[PDB]
Amino acid sequence: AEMKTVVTAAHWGSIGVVVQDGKVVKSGPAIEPAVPNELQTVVADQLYSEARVKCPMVRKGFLANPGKSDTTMRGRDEWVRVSWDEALDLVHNQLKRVRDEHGSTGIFAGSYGWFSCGSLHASRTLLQRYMNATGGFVGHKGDYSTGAAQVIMPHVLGTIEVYEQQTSWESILESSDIIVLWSANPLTTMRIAWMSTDQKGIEYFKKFQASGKRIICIDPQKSETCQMLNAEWIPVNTATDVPLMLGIAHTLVEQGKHDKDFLKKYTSGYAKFEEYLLGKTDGQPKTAEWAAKICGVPAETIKQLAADFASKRTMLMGGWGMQRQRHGEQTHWMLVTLASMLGQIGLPGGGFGLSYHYSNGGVPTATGGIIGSITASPSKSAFPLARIADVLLHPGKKIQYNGTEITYPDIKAVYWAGGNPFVHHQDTNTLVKAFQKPDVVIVNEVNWTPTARMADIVLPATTSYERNDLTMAGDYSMMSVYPMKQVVPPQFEAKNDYDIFVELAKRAGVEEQYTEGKTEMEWLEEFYNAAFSAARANRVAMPRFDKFWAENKPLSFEAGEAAKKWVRYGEFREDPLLNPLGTPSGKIEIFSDVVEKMNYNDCKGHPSWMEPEEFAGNVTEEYPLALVTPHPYYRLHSQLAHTSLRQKYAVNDREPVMIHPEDAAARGIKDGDIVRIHSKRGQVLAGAAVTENIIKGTVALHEGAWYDPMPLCKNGCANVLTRDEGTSKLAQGNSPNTCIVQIEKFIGVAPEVTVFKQPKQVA
Ligand SMILES: Nc1nc2c(c(=O)[nH]1)N[C@H]1C(S)=C(S)[C@@H](COP(=O)(O)OP(=O)(O)OC[C@H]3O[C@@H](n4cnc5c(=O)[nH]c(N)nc54)[C@H](O)[C@@H]3O)O[C@H]1N2
Ligand SMILES: Nc1nc2c(c(=O)[nH]1)N[C@H]1C(S)=C(S)[C@@H](COP(=O)(O)OP(=O)(O)OC[C@H]3O[C@@H](n4cnc5c(=O)[nH]c(N)nc54)[C@H](O)[C@@H]3O)O[C@H]1N2
Ligand SMILES: [Cl-]
Ligand SMILES: [Mo]
Ligand SMILES: [O]
């Protein structure tokens, strides 16, 4: 009777992996979760997939004329298998050429993506570490998650807000009468964390449901969360939450339910905003009736939400889909303004939180220590990252950004390691053109993703299961140190990214700076010991690394009474004169003079409603439906798309698209039919999921399906359809969820999806 389980971890949690005769045969949670997490069950598929990159590969046409090839052959050339020595020499020589001719401002290595958890084997960080050791690189600003909110919140609250600990969930359970999931789908989106999910956020949502208190979901779709918690669904048109919030706010004023004392003491600029709210400026009071016409919520329901939010202790939980769209800055600005008018900020169970849906925000912070991690350190060229296509195509172009002007650099080489821009970036067909501009495109990948398929040189990377690492239970509780013990040796000819970059560093003469003379296990011990020392200072005994590593189990910490009772903005509420915010006024900036003075047409000095170019309110005869692109339940973006989880959602071997029965009937579409979706940007195939769980006039296609072009995507990659434009001049965030489309039934034999097979090689 043998213990055949190795414990490791992923973004989707601590994983127990059963190994039989050197082969992985089962994976699942190392710690029982409140809700099953099927993402944990496919380690074997990840290890043994025929979609894996097996050996270093170079495009035929690039091998023939390196750095001087016909780059329009990217994505459609034959691949040549080469040795590691040949591939690494070629990467080094091609990057050296760019460094010699253009310098670091000719190399883009922002390399946005989620890769895998782990303190050491962080592929993106290891790439940037190599780039810095060899002279530097052009990176980026912001991220795709909160590109808008993370720029406006510093102006409004003096802090980034979206990536900070929330009021304790124990306070919510005890004191909140209502939680409002506004653009938030936590039973989907907390199946993962940036480190490794602690699995407790979903447990807390379940406890809140079981207490019988009110859960309200405001969303164009009746999401997995709304269904699984049997919450009250408020259907809303995508991109019309600001009108809805204005109508609620106007009702508060009309019924004397706003907190005038709070607004005077804790905010700046409320009176100027109220003039807009009441129509004194523009002739149009922002009534519940005015709002109902735009957002699709009946006026009497808007008024009843306002009364209930003010009558009960209410937590407004704002998710991020609604700021991933044109004018996205306005949504969380207005949510904070609404919370200010309700006046419950800083009270137990009250106010707002912008990370209750992300990585277990609000789970009480444990007392212990936090492990270290590798860094990129052994720019005027940096740009808001969703301008990447624009940058690659248009060197020298200038844009406005948060009160400054940015000049695009002139990029000759692109290196990606740990992200999938040909799935994650908007307007895929335009990104194809952008990727024809560089002299050389290099990708480290586990699998033959759409991005790998667009490269010149593809280097096979290992999964987490083929190496040793450490992570934490996260992202806020920090309640455990999770070992990531190697399960099997590297498969095929794959290498850890760390080893790839060690070989490149050696060719550049900087190996010693890159490795600091440490082995894998010496790095891990250094990272662990940071937690050990911090825990000791907190009076928490930990095993030393050798004992922890041998035990190969999560090491757990406990939360104390202070963390269980912690209320965000409690100190500000107690005394705002001595605990002011880091803003110009020391208060919540409902009107921001700093933003006003930027004089941007698409972001004013207070939250406001500005119609976007494409949304439910300006659909056309040609494109009569609106689109939303939520995050998927059975993938982390594009990760795990190639595994057996596909069978849990594919419809007729395509990505499912949610379609309301009346929109489907008007087109002769029945549940299960293949359909063609198209926009001005492109077209995709999808499988119809006909359901009343999407608001009429809108369709939902989850992001992350692998682009499989014929241009027409055979598989259903949502970003083939979306617009590539900045949210506004304030943040220049990405704007996928303001989009209009047409759908028609696909007639005849449908094409086979080929993007999970090995690519075309030479004969
Ligand atoms: N329409 C629309 N578009 C969106 C979104 C949306 O809501 N709607 N969401 C946006 C957001 S919030 C994000 S975060 C992005 C996500 O975009 P990405 O982060 O690019 O998506 P992932 O699928 O997680 O890509 C991670 C890649 O890293 C690889 N990888 C994993 N581990 C390793 C490793 O150790 N080494 C190497 N070399 N590779 C590894 C995986 O094989 C995988 O291809 O998508 C964004 N795009
Ligand atoms: N299982 C899983 N979990 C994940 C991810 C994943 O890919 N898979 N991605 C992770 C990442 S990188 C992030 S950034 C977060 C993303 O966290 P979010 O940004 O919050 O996730 P989304 O699914 O984009 O949006 C949540 C809800 O908002 C809705 N919504 C979209 N637009 C609007 C709007 O205009 N108004 C309203 N009222 N609702 C709208 C969506 O329909 C959706 O149900 O999740 C993380 N967690
Ligand atoms: Cl109280
Ligand atoms: Mo994200
Ligand atoms: O992200």
Domain regions of the chain by residue span:
3-30+468-485+516-557, 52-143+376-467+493-515, 145-364+567-592, 600-756
Mutational pocket test of ligand 2: of 40, 114, 189, the residue with most ligand atoms within 8 Å of the beta carbon: 189
Are the CB atoms for 444 and 128 separated by under 8 Å?
no
Helices (H), 37-181: 43-48, 60-64, 84-101, 123-133, 149-157, 169-175
- Residue from 229, 323, 631 to probe ligand 2 pocket by mutation (most atoms less than 8 Å from CB): 631
Long-range CB pairs of 89-94, under 8 A, 24+ apart, other chains included? 89/507, 90/58, 90/66, 90/457, 91/442, 91/457, 91/459, 91/504, 92/504, 92/507, 92/508, 93/66, 94/66, 94/67, 94/413, 94/439, 94/440, 94/442, 94/457
Check residue 585 and report its DSSP letter.
T
Determine which residue's CA is closest to atom 18 belonging to ligand 1: 113
User: Which two tokens mark 104?
Assistant: 């670091």
Q: Show the CA angle centred on residue 67, arms to residues 63 and 70, nearest 5°.
A: 75
Per-residue burial over 195-214, b = 16 or more CB atoms within 10 Å of its CB, e = otherwise: bbbbbbbbbbbeebbeeebb
Q: Nearest ligand, CA of residue 313? A: 3
Q: Which atom of ligand 1 is nearest to the CA of 452?
A: 44
Q: Which two three-digit tokens encode residue 262?
A: 């709070």
Contact 144/734 with Cβ under 8 angstroms? Answer: yes
Beta pairing partners, 473: 196
Distances (CA, A) of 498 to 127, 504, 609: 8, 10, 48
For tokens 């050339």, the residue is 77
Separation of CA 193 and ligand 5 centre (Å):
10
Backbone angles phi, psi at 583, to 5 degrees: -115, 170
Q: Compute the distance from residue 84 Cα to the ligand 1 centre, in Å.
A: 26
Ligand number, closest to the Cα atom of 149: 2
In this structure, how many other beta carbons lie within 10 angstroms of the beta carbon of residue 72?
Answer: 12
Which atom of ligand 2 lies closest to the CA of 637? 7
- Set 48, 79, 84, 114: catalytic member: 114
Residue that the structure tokens 């790839």 belong to: 500
Which ligand 1 atom is nearest residue 445's CA? 38
Q: Whose CA is closest to atom 47 on ligand 1?
A: 424
Residues with CB in 5 Å of ion ligand 3 = 348
**Does the beta carbon of 145 lie inside 6 Å of ligand 5?**
yes
Give the pair of three-digit tokens for residue 585: 């006024």
Contacts of 96 (CB under 8 A, 6+ apart): 508
Phi/psi-derived region of residue 206, left when phi > 0, alpha when psi is between -120 and 50, beta in every other case: alpha
Residue from 115, 183, 224 to probe ligand 2 pocket by mutation (most atoms less than 8 Å from CB):
183
Outline where 102-199 has alpha helix (H): 123-133, 149-157, 169-175, 186-189
Q: Whose CA is nearest to atom 3 of ligand 1?
A: 424
The C-alpha atoms of residue 755 and residue 758 are separated, in whole angstroms, by 8
Task: Please give the DSSP secondary-structure letter assigned to residue 674.
Answer: E
Method: X-ray
**Rounded to whole angstroms, how far apart are CA atoms 317 and 185?**
10
- For the CA of 635, the nearest atom of ligand 2: 8
Query: Is 465 considered catalytic here?
Result: no
Q: At how many Å resolution was this determined?
A: 1.7
> Kindly report the CA angle at 304 between 301 and 309, in degrees rounded to 5?
125
Q: Which two tokens stand for residue 607?
A: 């939250």
Burial label, 86 (beta-carbon count in 10 A; 0-12, 13-18, 19+): middle
- Hey, what are 377's tokens? 């350190």
Of the residues 79, 112, 169, 358, which is catalytic?
112
What is the crossing angle of helices 299-311 and 288-295, to 10°? 120
Q: Is residue 322 lining ligand 2, measured as CB closer than 6 Å?
A: yes
- Cβ of 143 less than 6 Å from ligand 5: yes
Q: Is the CB of 328 under 6 A from ligand 2?
A: no
Sequence letter at residue 525: E
| Residue 535, SS3 per DSSP | helix
φ and ψ at residue 125, rounded to 5 degrees: -65, -40
Is residue 641 a contact partner of residue 713, using CB atoms and an 8 Å limit? no
CB-defined site of ligand 1, < 6 Å: 113-116, 121, 123, 144-145, 324, 417-420, 424, 444-447, 449, 461, 497, 629, 631, 636-639, 703, 718-719, 722, 736
Q: Do the Cβ atoms of 233 and 224 come closer than 8 Å?
A: no
Ligand 4 centroid to Cα of residue 144, in Å, is: 5
β partners of residue 274? none
Q: Which of 702, 630, 664 is closest to 325 using CA atoms?
A: 630
**Best mutation site among 121, 446, 725 for ligand 1, i.e. most ligand atoms within 8 A of its Cβ?**
446
Tokens of 65: 């004329």
Cβ pair 141, 382 in contact under 8 A? yes
383 lines ligand 5 (CB under 6 A): no
Which of ligand 2's atoms lies nearest the C-alpha of 236? 38
Give the phi and the psi of residue 17 in degrees, each rounded to 5: -115, 125
Give residue 413's Cα distance to chain centre: 25
How many angstroms does the Cα of residue 161 sit away from the middle of ligand 5?
A: 15
Rounded to whole angstroms, the Cα distance separating 359 from 350 reads 20
- Extract the tokens encoding 435: 């990727």
**CA 719, 720, 721, 727 torsion: positive or negative?**
positive
Angle (CA) 555 558 564, round 5°:
150
State in Å: Cα 421 to ligand 1 middle.
7
Compute the distance from residue 704 Cα to the ligand 1 centre, in Å.
8
> How many A from CA of 151 to the centre of ligand 4?
15
Q: Check whether the bond before 475 is cis (ω within 30° of 0).
A: yes
- As a whole number of Å, the CA-based R_g of the chain is 26
Take atom 10 of ligand 2 and give the residue whose Cα is closest. Answer: 189
Please answer whether residues 338 and 249 qualify as being in contact, where contact means their C-beta atoms are separated by less than 8 angstroms: yes
Q: Compute how many other C-beta atoms are within 10 angstroms of the C-beta atom of residue 755.
A: 22
Atom 19 in ligand 1: which residue has the minimum CA distance?
113
Amino acid 703 reads E
Q: How far out from the chain centre does Cα 237 lie?
A: 22
CA of 565, nearest ligand number = 3
The H-or-E segment that residue 247 falls in is helix 241-254
- Work out the number of other CB atoms within 10 angstroms of the CB of residue 222: 19
What is the 355 CA–ligand 1 centroid distance (Å)? 20
How many Å separate Cα 299 from the centre of its chain? 33
Ligand 2 contact, 319 CB (< 6 A): yes
**Other Cβ atoms within 10 Å of 541 Cβ, number:** 7
Q: How far apart are the first and last CA of the chain?
A: 49
Q: Indicate whether residue 183 lines ligand 2 (CB < 6 A).
A: yes
* Pairing of β 625-628 and β 698-701: parallel
Residue 345 Cα distances to 266, 447, 727, angstroms? 10, 46, 27
User: How buried is residue 537: exposed, middle or buried, by Cβ count under 10 Å (0-12/13-18/19+)?
Assistant: exposed
Block residue for tokens 């590297």: 490
Residue 280's CB: how many other CB atoms inside 10 A? 11
Beta carbon of 194 within 6 Å of any ligand 5 atom: no
Q: Starting from the edge strand earliest in sequence, which strands make up the sheet with 351-353, in order?
A: 232-235, 214-219, 178-182, 314-318, 351-353
Q: Are strands 698-701 and 712-713 parallel, antiparallel or unpaired?
A: unpaired
Backbone angles phi, psi at 66, to 5 degrees: -60, 125
Q: Ligand 4 centre from 419 Cα, in Å? A: 11
> From the CA of 346, which ligand is nearest?
3
Two tokens, residue 567 = 């209320």
- Is-catalytic flag, 112? yes
Cα 181 to ligand 5 centre (Å)? 20
CA dist 185 and 189 (Å) reads 6
Q: State the greatest distance between any 2 C-alpha atoms of the chain, in Å, as a whole number.
A: 79
Cβ(197)–Cβ(474) below 8 Å: yes
- Please answer whether residues 626 and 248 qualify as being in contact, where contact means their C-beta atoms are separated by less than 8 angstroms: no
Tell whether the torsion through CA atoms of 171, 172, 178 and 180 is positive or negative.
positive
